[PDB]
DNA sequence: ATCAATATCCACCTGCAGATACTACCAAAAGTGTATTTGGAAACTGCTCCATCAAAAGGCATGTTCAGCTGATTCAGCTGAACATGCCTTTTGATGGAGCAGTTTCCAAATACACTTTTGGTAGTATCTGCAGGTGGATATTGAT
DNA sequence: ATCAATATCCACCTGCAGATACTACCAAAAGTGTATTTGGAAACTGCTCCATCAAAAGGCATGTTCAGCTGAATCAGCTGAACATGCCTTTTGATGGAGCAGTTTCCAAATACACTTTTGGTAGTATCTGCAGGTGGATATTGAT
């Protein structure tokens, strides 16, 4: 059952996230749109995190690498160090 | 022979989900998507367990909040249904476009 | 093996003064730690900037005070300032 | 020997704060009161959040503060919310809030 | 007796203003407003004249950008007329609230 | 110095035509009558935030004069970096 | 008797850039390659913008680059537009841009 | 009559290289000067943090390089990295 | 209205994941006493440019008029919500091994210091030139008809 | 379509602002060279904690049905654009001093170095408990009628 990983982010899960966001009714085309948006978000943050990893001459992305990438993207996160 | 009206379960879920704090995407699907994307940047990468969690926490918070703005954009246009144009308006005004 | 520092116990000491019967989860403590580190960085950062703008080699409480005003919203700033000036007064007079 | 924290009447480590300022390349030099002041500010802000998170724990019939309590504390206070306006508290969720046009008709 | 239809001069003005770079608010008025707001914060202040110019360049660029966002909120609502609610939608999405 | 004129209601020097122009540069074709007061409000908030910070830098420096540089640094703090005035 | 700029093949001033790095308290120590590498990046970026600004001046039949041309340069280029997405060029104006629905007829 | 420094003459040299018959207004120069200072501070800042995160006391061309990849978007980063590498290699061999 | 299907509420119970408690420990900060280096208020004064006055350039305020926009009403049809569960993907837990992190080493490179030269700034007085802002004159755009 | 009122686009000109120029000079640079300090790569290695996978758990892909939302069509009322009109306010150019900003002396304060005392992170072993998750039954909510 060959399938892209992006599609593992399913309709029900995207529906749950919308719900926490106060959304009542959802157009059918939202799901592909949301996946798009999520992929761009992960690209930008992952790009930066990996860049921290490479710099530290490591092969493992640490939580700290992620936390720092989030900070500089203006999305400070609390609870994973630093 | 008992059926809930359109929107009843929708409202019920909003209350349920605005009350809890669990992550709403399954861990595995998310983890693969992460590794996939990372591959385009460097091969042979490993991830700490807390690294993937941090990424999931951030992506869900980001998406939850964007659904807030999007919902405001749908309402502005006198609708109750979120559409791709509402997400697009939100992202454009946020200066992500 | 290497010692990993944290504000965790001071946060915990302050918790007890404020709510002697109340505890804290690990995850919550880690958040509180981030909080202090973050605010630390924002304040020192602004202070550094100030000293540089004014061609000074030193960060004094004057720099921290102006940093606090710039960074904190209204009422939070005022109290923080008064807690800060307070701590310096008490500290000096003490032998 | 008596700690600079106790001298200043503070639970927050003046010594550590002093050191962290030095090895932070914030400036060539560091005055004697700056760590004192800075440490008080941090103690102050911690207490503010801890009080309100405590109260949030109380409301939900709990004695153990969890991330959700910090989230409710911070976002229900105008000033704390503004200070942490570009910050994400892991495992905090959101404030219950539904746009009224979405409520069913009476 | 002659008249352009409503909207014709408006578009003419858009092309004209989008073409030039001069400050669109009168200098003295803007300067009095700065001095007033500052005086309410602290009496007996002077301003370097480029300080006032800085503020004015900043404020006009801020306001022009806000109007593009506002215009997009109106258009989203299938209108061509900007309204206070469009500005408010822009500022909320922008995280100015 | 003898006497020091009272400043009041200056927000109103931000006239209807000046606001229309800024809307134009910003691509706006049609403007409801209520936009003008709303714009004055928004402008005033923007100015207080930047002036506050600007004046704060001025006082820290022990000066009486607000510099271009005070403003430029206040603008930077607020994520509205300006080029053209020494920063 | 040779500058580090000629040694590196650069117009931008390595000595200056070395000096500015030290007094900015970015770290205890500054490596010898850092000002070299940084001065080159700076040179690169300023060449990139001047190229594009030069063209905007030429497109307007002008010989002197003014702030409007710098703004045309930056805003018309995807990458410089992003690098300066939170910056304002005094006296730069905006890009001519009218939304479709605003135009006459159908 | 204190000496106020700027990148003006270097901006002008580079301008001659790319557009030999084009001039620059002083205002346009002022903006050019702000832009270089701006990029400088932003790269130095990222390099600073980076070093600290890695418990380093030295900023080397390796730190600058990563700061450039963090700060600049795609194609500008690729090219800027070439030029800086080129300058260092050439700098090393030139003594 | 009533009636009933189902969601929601509160109370009480219970095992253990995750909290507090604890002592050794030792190592590494933080504090204490001595000698050294350095920064920046105060005192003074040149001198830039800020505040504050009168004359000229044109933008603002106000009333009128009606074009066309907005927002209400209605309505057909499309589209997303709700629904039941076997089925297939994720979760939980079990176990080697990559690699990250701890430690020690030694040297290439960085700091420090002290003449030695070069250069980037300004200042004085001059000297050149791109273009903004005026004119008139030829071609587009717009709206009545 | 045709006519015509009005904006727009050229082109050409000319003062003069503001730009490029240059000659004198200099202090603060950057450069050169020699002495001494050390950061971090580099190499070995120990033990987490990460990938992998088998077994156990359980959320979701499916298609069918229709309530109720979205968006097109239509229209009246009235807001906001255009424009004419009278003139008030801003802009432009030329004359007084508050305060900024540059020099210097001098001590109050921070650095440094080495020393001596404690605090805070870990690990060890065990010690303790708040509450998520389950039960039962009473009451609220929703939807059919
Ligand atoms: C509200 N009031 C009471 N306390 C808390 N906050 C700020 P201040 C005034 C002290
Ligand atoms: C004094 N401050 C610190 N804590 C205790 N009290 C009341 P709030 C502010 C919390
Ligand atoms: C709104 N109100 C409160 N503060 C912000 N803005 C402008 P003013 C009045 C000070
Ligand atoms: C800033 C402020 C506001 C209120 C109070 C109370 C205690 C009177 C104190 C400080
Ligand atoms: C000083 C003070 C006391 C209480 C609070 C909370 C309870 C709002 C904040 C500051
Ligand atoms: C409404 C109002 C007017 C002026 C201010 C200043 C003092 C910030 C605040 C609110
Ligand atoms: Mg006032
Ligand atoms: Ru108060
Ligand atoms: Ru309080
Ligand atoms: Ru106000």
Automatic annotation (TrEMBL), chains D, G:
<keyword id="KW-0597">Phosphoprotein</keyword>
<dbReference type="GO" id="GO:0030527">
    <property type="term" value="F:structural constituent of chromatin"/>
</dbReference>
<comment type="similarity">
    <text>Belongs to the histone H2A family.</text>
</comment>
<feature type="domain" description="Core Histone H2A/H2B/H3">
    <location>
        <begin position="1"/>
        <end position="75"/>
    </location>
</feature>
<dbReference type="GO" id="GO:0003677">
    <property type="term" value="F:DNA binding"/>
</dbReference>
<keyword id="KW-0158">Chromosome</keyword>
<protein>
    <recommendedName>
        <fullName>Histone H2A</fullName>
    </recommendedName>
</protein>
<keyword id="KW-0238">DNA-binding</keyword>
<keyword id="KW-1017">Isopeptide bond</keyword>
<keyword id="KW-0832">Ubl conjugation</keyword>
<comment type="subunit">
    <text>The nucleosome is a histone octamer containing two molecules each of H2A, H2B, H3 and H4 assembled in one H3-H4 heterotetramer and two H2A-H2B heterodimers. The octamer wraps approximately 147 bp of DNA.</text>
</comment>
<dbReference type="GO" id="GO:0031507">
    <property type="term" value="P:heterochromatin formation"/>
</dbReference>
<dbReference type="GO" id="GO:0005634">
    <property type="term" value="C:nucleus"/>
</dbReference>
<feature type="domain" description="Histone H2A C-terminal">
    <location>
        <begin position="78"/>
        <end position="106"/>
    </location>
</feature>
<dbReference type="GO" id="GO:0000786">
    <property type="term" value="C:nucleosome"/>
</dbReference>
<keyword id="KW-0544">Nucleosome core</keyword>
<dbReference type="GO" id="GO:0046982">
    <property type="term" value="F:protein heterodimerization activity"/>
</dbReference>
<keyword id="KW-0007">Acetylation</keyword>
<keyword id="KW-0539">Nucleus</keyword>
<comment type="function">
    <text>Core component of nucleosome. Nucleosomes wrap and compact DNA into chromatin, limiting DNA accessibility to the cellular machineries which require DNA as a template. Histones thereby play a central role in transcription regulation, DNA repair, DNA replication and chromosomal stability. DNA accessibility is regulated via a complex set of post-translational modifications of histones, also called histone code, and nucleosome remodeling.</text>
</comment>
């Amino acid at each position: 059952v060959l399938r892209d990983n992006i599609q593992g982010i399913t309709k029900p899960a995207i529906r749950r996230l919308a719900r926490r966001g106060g959304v009542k009714r959802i157009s059918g085309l939202i799901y592909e749109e949301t996946r798009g948006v999520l992929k761009v978000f992960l690209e930008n943050v992952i790009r930066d995190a990996v860049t921290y990893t490479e710099h530290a001459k490591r092969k493992t992305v640490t939580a700290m690498d992620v936390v720092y990438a989030l900070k500089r993207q203006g999305r400070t996160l609390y609870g994973f160090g630093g | 022979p008992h059926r809930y009206r359109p929107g009843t379960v929708a409202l019920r879920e909003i209350r349920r989900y605005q009350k809890s704090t669990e992550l709403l995407i399954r861990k595995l699907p998310f983890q693969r998507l992460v590794r996939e994307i990372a591959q385009d940047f460097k091969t042979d990468l490993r991830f700490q367990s807390s690294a993937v969690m941090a990424l999931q926490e951030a992506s869900e918070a980001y998406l939850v909040a964007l659904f807030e703005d999007t919902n405001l954009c749908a309402i502005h246009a006198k609708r109750v249904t979120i559409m791709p144009k509402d997400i697009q308006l939100a992202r454009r005004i946020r200066g992500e476009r | 093996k290497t010692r990993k520092e944290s504000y965790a116990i001071y946060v915990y000491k302050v918790l007890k003064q404020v709510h002697p019967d109340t505890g804290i989860s690990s995850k919550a403590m880690s958040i509180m730690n981030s909080f202090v580190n973050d605010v630390f960085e924002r304040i020192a950062g602004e202070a550094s900037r100030l000293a540089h703008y004014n061609k000074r080699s030193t960060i004094t409480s004057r720099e921290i005070q102006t940093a606090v005003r710039l960074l904190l919203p209204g009422e939070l700033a005022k109290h923080a300032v008064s807690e800060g000036t307070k701590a310096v007064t008490k500290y000096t007079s003490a032998k | 020997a008596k700690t600079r924290s106790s001298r200043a009447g503070l639970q927050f480590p003046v010594g550590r704060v002093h050191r962290l300022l030095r090895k932070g390349n914030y400036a060539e030099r560091v005055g004697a009161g700056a760590p004192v002041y800075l440490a008080a500010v941090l103690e102050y802000l911690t207490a503010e959040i801890l009080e309100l998170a405590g109260n949030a724990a109380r409301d939900n019939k709990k004695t153990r503060i969890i991330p959700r309590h910090l989230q409710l504390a911070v976002r229900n206070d105008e000033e704390l919310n503004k200070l942490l306006g570009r910050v994400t508290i892991a495992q905090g969720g959101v404030l219950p809030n539904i746009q009224s046009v979405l409520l069913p008709k009476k």
